[PDB]
Design a protein around this ligand. Structure first.
Ligand SMILES: CO[C@H]1O[C@H](COS(=O)(=O)O)[C@@H](O[C@@H]2O[C@@H](C(=O)O)[C@@H](O[C@H]3O[C@H](COS(=O)(=O)O)[C@@H](O[C@@H]4O[C@H](C(=O)O)[C@@H](O[C@H]5O[C@H](COS(=O)(=O)O)[C@@H](OC)[C@H](OC)[C@H]5OS(=O)(=O)O)[C@H](OC)[C@H]4OC)[C@H](OS(=O)(=O)O)[C@H]3OS(=O)(=O)O)[C@H](OC)[C@H]2OS(=O)(=O)O)[C@H](OS(=O)(=O)O)[C@H]1OS(=O)(=O)O
Ligand SMILES: *[C@@H]1O[C@H](CO)[C@@H](O[C@@H]2O[C@H](CO)[C@@H](O)[C@H](O)[C@H]2NC(C)=O)[C@H](O)[C@H]1NC(C)=O
Ligand SMILES: *[C@@H]1O[C@H](CO)[C@@H](O)[C@H](O)[C@H]1NC(C)=O
Length: 406
């Protein structure tokens, strides 16, 4: 029960440490600085990701999930492998106690969230070759702080036999929602260590849409053409705000209020690309603060964004080079050993009931008469998505709906 535990409880200290040359109610100040760091990595990682994709492509990922995974390697990392790891994931920007116990505080953070009607649900695990003897202590720390210890498999001789085993463990742990996490030809005979983290969300809208009001409507893609979308519609009070250069910021809370979705819709004349490059941990928080309740009309499309990519190339571009290099990798705490590949997979499906909800609810509203000048948030062009937890402001999922059609 890593949740209700304290650092000194189960002693877990990293073989190598790295030293670089206000707080919400009912919250542990350690978990807070860490969460704020995930954010500095979230926007930087999303920007690099966006800039390398076509504007008409959707995106979705869990920056939190990816951060926890690579925190599990920071544990046994050493030398340049550890520095790059710290600088790339913005870990070098926190205090020493939290830094050395970075893995523990992640388990704490994830506890707080994996506890807050709306259920999260993931499958994270490291796979290493059986031919290697794994440092038992690291194994014990992971087992307790990361759900399970590193699982050994025979890649050396059973590459495909093992690659099927991994794609099976995720399916069984995600009720069949995340499949084929690892695409064939990914794990071969020289595969020694593989990172895997998948996740999706189950939740209901605090304020539901009625399927009776959903209509087919044009959605204007970045290419200049338009396609047919299923546009949901509803009226009510929502934390909203028209910010800089006409960009609209809407917040649709999930049942419980602790977790919500934030949409960033730019004005017709401004490309989502310009918003993506102006995005910063600050600017975002700045918008969220200005959010003010209001009675508005909400036009939003039903959509499903599935994104299963290999963090490797992306992260190498970002500077995490050694962790992937056979000749430069330094992971003395896990055994040379290096990361052959890292696979992340998350998906989001939004509809009238909520996220991953398979039911229907009509909606009857009598005695209502709103102001004729009320505003209307109409997401009929590309928009950014954030699934976050309040009041920590932790970014759990982040993505883009560039095309909700078909
Ligand atoms: C040289 O300086 C650096 O190193 C030294 C030594 O390092 S080492 O010991 O690791 O080797 C550091 O000193 C140690 O660190 C202290 C510290 O506070 O960080 C201290 O830690 C221990 O005691 C604290 C205080 O305990 S309390 O009982 O008095 O509160 C403890 O932290 C508390 O944890 C609570 C918790 O339940 O998690 C917090 O409660 C709030 O949050 C929870 C849930 O949060 S979350 O879900 O959001 O995450 C919430 O529950 C729903 C509570 O609601 C009731 C919240 O409370 S409320 O008041 O907000 O409502 C407490 O409030 C924030 C929090 O107090 C700070 C700590 O647990 S830990 O944070 O989990 O680590 C505990 O750790 S230990 O048991 O493992 O040790 C150490 O004293 C023993 C201290 O060692 S010393 O005595 O030898 O000095 C330096 O840290 S510091 O500067 O002193 O803080 C470190 O400096 S640096 O900052 O790292 O650079
Ligand atoms: C296995 O890894 C652990 C740590 O990951 C190593 O033990 C650490 O040793 C240093 C000093 O030698 C201590 O400061 C740490 O506190 C120890 N870790 C903990 C928390 O116990 C251990 O030596 C490694 N052994 C192998 C198999 O190489
Ligand atoms: C790597 O870092 C350690 C300190 O943790 C240091 O002792 C060692 O000399 C560095 N380089 C090598 C060759 O291991």
């Amino acid at each position: 029960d890593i949740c209700t535990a304290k650092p000194r409880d189960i002693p877990m200290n990293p073989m190598c440490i790295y030293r670089s040359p206000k707080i919400p109610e009912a919250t542990n100040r350690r978990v807070w600085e860490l969460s704020k760091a995930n954010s500095r990595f979230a926007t930087t990682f999303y920007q690099h990701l966006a800039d390398s994709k076509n504007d008409n492509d959707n995106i979705f990922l869990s920056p939190l999930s990816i951060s926890t995974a690579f925190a599990m390697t920071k544990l046994g990392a050493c030398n340049d492998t550890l520095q790059q790891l710290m600088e790339v994931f913005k870990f070098d920007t926190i205090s020493e106690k939290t830094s050395d116990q970075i893995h523990f505080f992640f388990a704490k953070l994830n506890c707080r969230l994996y506890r807050k009607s709306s259920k999260l649900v993931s499958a994270n695990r490291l796979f290493g070759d059986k031919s290697l003897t794994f440092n038992e202590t690291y194994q014990d720390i992971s087992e307790l702080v990361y759900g399970a210890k590193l699982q050994p498999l025979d890649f050396k001789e059973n590459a495909e036999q093992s690659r099927a085993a991994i794609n099976k463990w995720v399916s069984n742990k995600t009720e069949g929602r995340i499949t084929d996490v690892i695409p064939s030809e990914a794990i071969n005979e020289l595969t020694v260590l593989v990172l895997v983290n998948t996740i999706y969300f189950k939740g209901l809208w605090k304020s539901k849409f009625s399927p009776e009001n959903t209509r087919k409507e044009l959605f204007y893609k970045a290419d200049g053409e338009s396609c047919s979308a299923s546009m949901m519609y509803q009226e009510g009070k929502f934390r909203y705000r028209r910010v800089a250069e006409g960009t609209q910021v809407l917040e649709l809370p999930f049942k419980g209020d602790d977790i919500t979705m934030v949409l960033i819709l730019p004005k017709p004349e401004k490309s989502l690309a310009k918003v993506e490059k102006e995005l910063t941990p600050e600017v975002l928080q700045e918008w969220l603060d200005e959010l003010e309740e209001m009675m508005l009309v909400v036009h939003m499309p039903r959509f499903r964004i599935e994104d299963g990519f290999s963090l490797k190339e992306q992260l190498q571009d970002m500077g995490l080079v050694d962790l992937f290099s056979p000749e430069k990798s330094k992971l003395p705490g896990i055994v040379d050993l290096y990361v052959s590949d890292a696979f992340h997979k998350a998906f989001l499906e939004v509809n009238e009931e909520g996220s991953e909800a398979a039911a229907s609810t009509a909606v009857v509203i009598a005695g209502r008469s709103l102001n004729p000048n009320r505003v209307t948030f109409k997401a009929n062009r590309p928009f950014l998505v954030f699934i976050r937890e309040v009041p920590l402001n932790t970014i759990i999922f982040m993505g883009r709906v560039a095309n909700p059609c078909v």
